[PDB]
Amino acid sequence: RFTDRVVLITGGGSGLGRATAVRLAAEGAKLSLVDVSSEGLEASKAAVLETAPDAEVLTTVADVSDEAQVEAYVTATTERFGRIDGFFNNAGIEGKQNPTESFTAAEFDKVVSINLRGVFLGLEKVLKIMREQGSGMVVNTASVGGIRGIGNQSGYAAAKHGVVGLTRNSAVEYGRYGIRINAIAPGAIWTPMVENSMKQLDPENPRKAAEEFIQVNPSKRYGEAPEIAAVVAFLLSDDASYVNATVVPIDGGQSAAY
Amino acid sequence: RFTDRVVLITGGGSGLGRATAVRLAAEGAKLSLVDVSSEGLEASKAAVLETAPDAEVLTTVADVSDEAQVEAYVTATTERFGRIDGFFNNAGIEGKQNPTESFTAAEFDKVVSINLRGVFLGLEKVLKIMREQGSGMVVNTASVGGIRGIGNQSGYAAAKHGVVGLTRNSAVEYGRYGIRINAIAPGAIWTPMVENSMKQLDPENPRKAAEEFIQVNPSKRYGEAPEIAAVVAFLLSDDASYVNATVVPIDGGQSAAY
Amino acid sequence: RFTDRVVLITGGGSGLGRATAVRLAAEGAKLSLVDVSSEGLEASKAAVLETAPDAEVLTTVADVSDEAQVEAYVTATTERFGRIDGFFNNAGIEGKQNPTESFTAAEFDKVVSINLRGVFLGLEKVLKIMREQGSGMVVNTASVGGIRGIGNQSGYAAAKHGVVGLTRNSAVEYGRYGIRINAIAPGAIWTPMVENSMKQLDPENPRKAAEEFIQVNPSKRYGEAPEIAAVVAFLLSDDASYVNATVVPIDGGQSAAY
Amino acid sequence: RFTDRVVLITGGGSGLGRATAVRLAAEGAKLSLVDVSSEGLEASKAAVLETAPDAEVLTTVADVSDEAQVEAYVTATTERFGRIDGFFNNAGIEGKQNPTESFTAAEFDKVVSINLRGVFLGLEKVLKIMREQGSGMVVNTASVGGIRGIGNQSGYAAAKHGVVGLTRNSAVEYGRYGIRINAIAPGAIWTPMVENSMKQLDPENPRKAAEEFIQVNPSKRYGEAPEIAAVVAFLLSDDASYVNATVVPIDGGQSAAY
Ligand SMILES: NC(=O)c1ccc[n+]([C@@H]2O[C@H](COP(=O)([O-])OP(=O)(O)OC[C@H]3O[C@@H](n4cnc5c(N)ncnc54)[C@H](O)[C@@H]3O)[C@@H](O)[C@H]2O)c1
Ligand SMILES: NC(=O)c1ccc[n+]([C@@H]2O[C@H](COP(=O)([O-])OP(=O)(O)OC[C@H]3O[C@@H](n4cnc5c(N)ncnc54)[C@H](O)[C@@H]3O)[C@@H](O)[C@H]2O)c1
Ligand SMILES: NC(=O)c1ccc[n+]([C@@H]2O[C@H](COP(=O)([O-])OP(=O)(O)OC[C@H]3O[C@@H](n4cnc5c(N)ncnc54)[C@H](O)[C@@H]3O)[C@@H](O)[C@H]2O)c1
C-alpha cells in the first residue's frame, strides 16, 4: 500500500517509530527518519534494510521542541524525496513520575515542550506541504493517558490529551483537502519507554511492577511494537481514506473497560 | 491477510456487507454470506466472483431477529467450512423517522429486534465457536448514531448505542482468549440505506436533502462502501491483534467536530 | 428549587428512586412515584413524609415494560397534579450474570424490555406533555455499564448503552422547547440492586466480592444513594438550564481512570 | 450549601468567574478572587456585595502563568481565611484564530502558558493544601473545544484538552482523600471572551457571526453566565460528593449531537 510513497517519522530511532519504519518499508515506502539520537537512527535504518534491502532511508538528527530544527527535518525530507505522503508525528518522553503537588513546573514544562509543542510544530510545517499537494495522511501519537487518567503523570496526561486536541482541531480544518489526521492511543506496549516506566514505578523490582500492571488488562498481555506499526500503517494508507479526527486505542481493550 | 480464512458476514446481500465481501475475497478469504434477501445474496456472490474467480462463497437466507435462523446460518457455516475466523455482525435497518413522541412502540421494537437482538444472537452463537478455536476477530456494525444523537431516530439510536455496549461488554469477556471484538461507526456512506434515509428526510427532494446533510462534514463529501470495507478488513485481520473493545468512526471527522 | 414543582419517578419504591424522592420533597416538590412493588411505594412515601410532613405524594403500581401501564401512570400523574415538571426515568433490573455465549435470549429480552423499552415508552408519553407545556426536565438512569464494559452483563450493557442513545437522540429533538434531557451513569452505589449483584458475583462470600470490587476505585469507597439523589436534583432543577444530552458519571472517578 | 466555606476563583474579575462568585456568595461562601485586572476585581467584588452585603471577599492581582504569583495568591488566601474548601481554576484566554499552518509558535506558547500551565500550577499548590485538610472540591474550566474540534484554534484546543487531562490524572490521584476534581466544558455562553471570539470570526459583522454560530445548537440559543455558575456551584458543593474526574458539558447539547 506504500509503493513509492514518502513517509516521515519522528522518534524514528527507537520503539514504535522503528517498528513502524520496518512495517512501512516492507510495504514499499520511502522513509525519512528523525530523532535526537544518531545512534538510534543508525540502528533503525539497519533494521529497515534487513527487511527491505532496496529501501530508500534518510536519517536526520533534530530536536522536535525546537522550531528551527523542525523546519530543518522537513526541508531535509522534501529536498531528498520531493514530497511527504505520510507523517507519523511520534516523538515523545514520559517524564518523572510524581503526584500533582510534587510534579514540579520544570518537569511539566519539559514534557509539554517535547510531547505537545513538538507535535504542534510538526503539524504546522507538514500540513502546509500536504495542503499544497492536495493529499496526505497524518498520525499523531497520543496514549491511553491522552484519553484517560493514569495517575502520577501530570505532564504526560496534559501533553497527550493536548495531542488529541491538536488531532481533532487540525482534522476539522484540513479534511476538506482530502488530508486525514488521526491519533493512536497505545496502552501497555513493551517498548523502551514502557520498560523505563516500570523502572520508575518500582526501582527495586521493575519485573514485579510490569507483571502487576498488566493483570487487569482484558487481553491479559502486553502488546508488541509491530502491533502498533500495523495500525499506523493502516491509518497512513488509502484504507483510511474516510477515517478522520479519530483516536484509535491499541490497548487490548482496557480504556473501554470499567 | 485472509488467505484461507473463513469470514461470516450478515447483511451480506447489499451495501457494506457486499463491499466487505469483495474486499476480503480479494485478500483470499473464504466467505459465508447471510441475508434475508436471496436475490441480494446472489448479486453479492456474483460481485465477489468477478473480483476473485476462485473464491469459495456460501450463501444462506436467514432473518437475524429469529434465534432459530441465527443458529441455522452459524451451523451452515461450520458444516461447510469447519471454522469461523472472522465475523462481520452487520445486518440492520434504519426504521421510520419520527420524533420520540410519535416514533411508536411497534417501530421501536422492530428496529431493536433486528439491529440489537440480531447482533446479540450472532455474538452468543459465534463467540462460543471462537473461544473453542482459541482465536477469532469480530466487527459489529454500529453507527455515528451509536455514539451521538442524530434526531428523529429513537429506535436506531437506542439499538446502535446498544451494539456499542455489546461490543464493549463482550470484548472484556473474550479478550483473554486472543479474540478481538470491535465496532465500526459509519457516518454518511452512500449505500441503499442512506439513499432511502434521504428519501425519508425529504420525499419531495431527496437529492437536496443529501446535499444539505453533508455540507457540515469536515471532509465535505459522502464516504463510499469500499472505504468502510477497508477498515473492516483491517479490524478482521492480524493487523488488529491488539485492538479491542474499540469503536472506530468512519465519518470524515464529523463525530469529533463541535 | 422545587417548590410546587411536580416530579414523576419510576422505580420510586426503592434505592435511587426513593432517595431522590426524599431529596426532592425536602426541596418542596410534589411527587408521583411509580413501581411494580406496592410495599416499596408505601415505604418510600413514609420516608418522604418523615422529611417533609406536608408533602403531596401519589403512588401508582405499574410495570414499565407494559405500554398500557406506562400510559396509566402518566395519566394518573396528570389527573392528580395537572402537569409534569420533572421526570426521573429510573426503573430497572440487573439481569442474571453470564458470559455472552451463556447469557440466553430470554434473559437478554427481559432486561431490554424493562431497562430500555421502559425508558423509551416513558419518554414517548412524557415528552409530548412537556412539549405542550413548553418546559420540562428529564433524567434517564443509565449506568457506568452504559458507557463502559463491565463484563458478564450482555443484557444490561446493551440496554444501558441504549438509554444513553435515547438520551442523546431525544435531547437533540426537544432542546428547542427549553426541555432538557440528560442521563446519570451511577457506579458502585450501595442499593438493593448492587447488593444482589455482589450476591451473584460470589454467593458464598458476597461481602468479599464487594470488598474486592471497590479496591480499584479512585475514591476507595462505595457511593451512597443520597449522593445520587443530589445529582438528580441538580439535573431536574433550573440550575441545569443549559445542560442537555449529557451523561454524568457518579462513580468516584473510575470510568475516567485507565 | 456554602455557609462559611472558602472558595478561590481565578479569572474572577469577569465573565464566568464573576458570575460564579455572585452565585456562591448567595449561598453563603467566603471568596478569594484572583485576576490580572484590578478594575475587573473591583467590579466583581462590588457585584458580589450587591447580592450578599455580608460576604467576605478578598481580591488579589496575579498572572497565573507565573509560578511566583500563583504561590502568592494561594498564600494570600490562606493567610486571610486559613483554608481553601473550593477552587474554580478558571482563568483563560482564547488566542488569535488561524488554521494550524498559520497559528504560529508564539501564539501557541501564549495560550498554553495561561490556559494549561496556569491550571497545572494552581492544582499543584492548592491540592497540597486540600490533602492536608482531608477535603476539598475543584472545578477546572475546560471547554467544548477541550473535548471536540472547533477549528482554527490549535492553541486553545491543545490547552483545553490538556486541562481535561490534568482533571482526570489529578482526580485519580486525590480521590482517596475525599477530594473531588472535575471539569466543565462550556459551549456558546455569552461572556466577554465569546463576544470577542465572534469579532475575530467576522470583524465586519460580529452580530451575523454570532447568530450564524448558534443556529445549529439543539437549544437554539446562547447560554448565559449564571447558567454556568449554577453548575459550578453544584460541582463545588457536597452535592457532588461522589462525582469525580468527569467533564460536564454545558452547551445546550451540541457536543452530543452528530
Ligand atoms: N502507554 C503509553 O502511554 C505509551 C506506550 C508506548 C509508546 N507511547 C508513545 O509512543 C511514542 C514513542 O514511544 P516509544 O515507546 O517508541 O519510546 P522510545 O523511547 O523507544 O522512542 C522514542 C524516541 O523518540 C526520541 N525522542 C525523544 N525526545 C525527542 C526530541 N526532543 N526530538 C526528537 N526525538 C526525540 C527518542 O530518542 C526515541 O528514539 C511516544 O510519543 C510515547 O509517548 C505511549
Ligand atoms: N450513518 C449510518 O448510520 C450508517 C450508514 C451506512 C450503514 N450503516 C449500518 O451498516 C449496516 C449495513 O447497512 P447498509 O448501508 O449496507 O444497508 P443495506 O440496506 O444496503 O444492506 C443491509 C442488508 O441487511 C439485510 N437485512 C436487513 N434486515 C435483516 C434481517 N432481519 N436479517 C438478515 N438480513 C437483514 C438487508 O436485506 C440488506 O441486504 C447496517 O447495520 C447499517 O445500520 C449505518
Ligand atoms: N452500577 C450500576 O450499574 C448501577 C448502581 C445503582 C443503580 N443503577 C441503576 O439505577 C436505577 C435504580 O436502581 P436501584 O439501585 O435503586 O435498584 P433497586 O432495585 O433498589 O430499585 C429499582 C426499583 O425499580 C423497580 N422496578 C424494577 N422493574 C420494574 C418494572 N418492570 N416496572 C416498574 N418498576 C420496576 C423495582 O421494584 C425497584 O423498586 C436502575 O435503573 C439501575 O439499573 C445502576
Ligand SMILES: NC(=O)c1ccc[n+]([C@@H]2O[C@H](COP(=O)([O-])OP(=O)(O)OC[C@H]3O[C@@H](n4cnc5c(N)ncnc54)[C@H](O)[C@@H]3O)[C@@H](O)[C@H]2O)c1
Ligand atoms: N466555548 C468556550 O470555549 C468557552 C466559553 C466561555 C468561557 N470559556 C472558558 O471559561 C473561562 C472564563 O472565560 P470568560 O468567558 O469568563 O472570559 P473573560 O475574558 O470574561 O474572563 C476571563 C478572566 O480571566 C482573566 N485572565 C486572563 N489571563 C489571565 C492570566 N494570565 N492571569 C490571571 N487572570 C487572567 C481575565 O482578565 C478575565 O478577567 C476561560 O477559561 C474560558 O476559556 C470557554
